Amino acid sequence: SCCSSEDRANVMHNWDAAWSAAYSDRRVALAQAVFASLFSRDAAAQGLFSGVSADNPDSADFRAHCVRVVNGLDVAINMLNDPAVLNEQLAHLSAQHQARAGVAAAHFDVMAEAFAEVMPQVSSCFSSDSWNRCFARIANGISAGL
């Protein structure tokens, strides 16, 4: 359950590949796929994103939301080596989700298995264990007090 050093390094690698700092087109493919399942396994959840053209994944309004998330995760994944900072970020990200009527702790588990399904399809030789160990470390922080 502890996202170790060898874990973050290993996860930062998985996420290093399958990622493009130049073009957002890929970040979106990843995000969309994540959401694809997310909703597919919790229709009710899709409602939380009415504030975004969720009904139309292929819509700017939505793909824009993808970037934010994909970016938010990437921003946290990179702090994974500098805990002190990460905390502030997760703390932040947290309050933002609290500010969202609905989204509760549980939801992050669906989102958890959501990524857990998409990653192996984007990054080569992805190491599930390390990702599951650290994706929690992060998610827990956001869903905390939520």
Partner: peptide
């Protein structure tokens, strides 16, 4: 506090750059 913040800013600024091709988004 500020380091998070600083990093966050670069985050957003990275989206824009990465999105520069797609005006709508």
């Amino acid at each position: 506090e500020f380091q998070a913040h600083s990093l966050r800013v670069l985050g957003g600024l990275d989206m824009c750059v990465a999105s520069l091709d797609d005006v709508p988004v």
